[PDB]
Amino acid sequence: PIVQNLQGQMVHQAISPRTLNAWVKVVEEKAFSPEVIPMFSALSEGATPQDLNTMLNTVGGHQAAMQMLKETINEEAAEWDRLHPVHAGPIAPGQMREPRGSDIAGTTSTLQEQIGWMTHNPPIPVGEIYKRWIILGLNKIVRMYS
Amino acid sequence: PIVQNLQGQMVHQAISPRTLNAWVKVVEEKAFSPEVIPMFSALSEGATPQDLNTMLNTVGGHQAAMQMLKETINEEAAEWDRLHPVHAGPIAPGQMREPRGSDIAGTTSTLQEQIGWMTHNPPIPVGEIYKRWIILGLNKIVRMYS
Ligand SMILES: COCCN/C=C1/C(=O)N(C)c2ccc(C(F)(F)F)cc2N(c2ccccc2)C1=O
Numbered sequence: 663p664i665v666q667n668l669q670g671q672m673v674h675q676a677i678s679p680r681t682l683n684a685w686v687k688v689v690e691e692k693a694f695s696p697e698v699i700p701m702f703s704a705l706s707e708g709a710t711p712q713d714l715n716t717m718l719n720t721v722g723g724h725q726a727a728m729q730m731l732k733e734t735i736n737e738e739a740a741e742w743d744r745l746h747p748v749h750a751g752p753i754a755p756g757q758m759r760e761p762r763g764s765d766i767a768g769t770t771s772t773l774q775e776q777i778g779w780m781t782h783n784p785p786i787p788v789g790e791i792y793k794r795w796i797i798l799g800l801n802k803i804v805r806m807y808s
Numbered sequence: 809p810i811v812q813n814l815q816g817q818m819v820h821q822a823i824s825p826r827t828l829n830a831w832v833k834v835v836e837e838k839a840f841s842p843e844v845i846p847m848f849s850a851l852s853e854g855a856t857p858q859d860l861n862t863m864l865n866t867v868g869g870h871q872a873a874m875q876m877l878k879e880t881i882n883e884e885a886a887e888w889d890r891l892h893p894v895h896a897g898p899i900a901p902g903q904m905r906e907p908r909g910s911d912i913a914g915t916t917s918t919l920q921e922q923i924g925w926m927t928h929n930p931p932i933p934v935g936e937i938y939k940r941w942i943i944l945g946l947n948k949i950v951r952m953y954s
Pocket residue numbers: 686689690692693694695696698699702717718721722723724725727728731800801803804
């Protein structure tokens with residue numbers, strides 16, 4: 663997630679491995695449990711898409727449940743593009759481009775571009791947007807158990 | 809916890825009731841379980857003493873376990889005073905005073921004074937210090953189950 667250092671700068675701070683390890687243990691004990699969702703949202707506060715994917719990849723899960731999660735994310739990303747089309751073409755070096763669904767999901771964006779959108783004014787909270795997509799998918803999983 | 813708003817300012821953001829509710833459910837299911845500790849540290853990122861006490865009070869627990877926790881905190885606070893004595897007496901209005909153990913524990917300090925120490929340069933991370941005392945006590949509890 664993003665936090666301000668001892669100067670003023672908004673810097674990225676990776677998620678602690680000990681937090682990740684404890685989290686996977688929680689999910690393992692409360693598989694498909696609704697209470698895990700508010701906890702997921704709590705631990706991902708200020709998280710960038712990169713951080714979110716690290717959490718998702720670390721947890722893993724059932725092949726099938728991961729599918730519904732990915733499909734949900736993909737569906738929401740395509741819905742973002744349908745509503746927020748981005749222009750392709752000429753852009754000067756260092757110019758900020760508008761994020762597409764795949765950028766919000768961290769697939770086609772770097773940590774630096776994610777931080778840029780998140781610390782911009784007006785900000786494009788790509789971390790918050792992606793988290794919502796994930797939570798939608800998690801809420802879908804709990805309701806099928808697959 | 810403290811977070812920067814849409815201007816630049818370091819503002820306080822209370823813990824979500826939904827997070828608190830989910831957390832108490834976790835502790836209830838994993839009573840005295842070591843894995844809860846890394847999770848406690850994760851959710852209290854950037855937390856002020858006020859936030860920490862809200863979490864502690866919300867969780868509650870066994871009369872006896874709460875005792876060892878309080879006694880541990882009290883013991884560490886007295887140890888902080890023994891090593892970092894603070895001068896009493898004349899101080900101008902609005903002057904920043906050095907925190908004593910009771911201030912770090914949020915007993916004799918306001919949310920505003922806690923934020924002041926935490927956003928000062930060099931900072932007095934009262935939230936981090938208090939969190940360590942709590943985690944020491946939690947590690948004590950797990951090892952007695954009381
Ligand atoms: C470590 O795996 C052990 C067995 N549990 C697997 C699960 C699963 O298959 N998926 C795909 C995932 C993926 C990410 C997460 C996340 F960390 F993000 F929360 C939870 C989660 N949930 C889940 C979903 C909804 C509500 C509660 C838990 C599971 O139970």
